[PDB]
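Posted in: Protein Modeling Q&A

I'm a second-year student putting together a small comparison for a lab meeting, and my supervisor asked me to include a predicted structure for Fungal defensin plectasin variant NZ2114. I've never done this before, so apologies if this is the wrong subforum. The sequence is pasted below exactly as I got it from our records. If anyone can share the structure token output, I'd also love a short note on what stands out.
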Amino acid sequence: GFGCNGXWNEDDLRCHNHCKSIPXYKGGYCAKXGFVCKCY
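Accepted answer (user: helix_wrangler)
Welcome! Here is the predicted structure, written out as tokens:
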């Protein structure tokens, strides 16, 4: 979710913005076939 909805539906930027929108995170990237929005 959160932009990451698969290999052919991978919005790394949307995951990044999502996670960046969360206090204590700097960004995010799509993992697990681009399905999981990994916040860092």
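A couple of things worth pointing out for your meeting: The two ends are 16 Å apart (CA to CA). Helices lie at 12-20.
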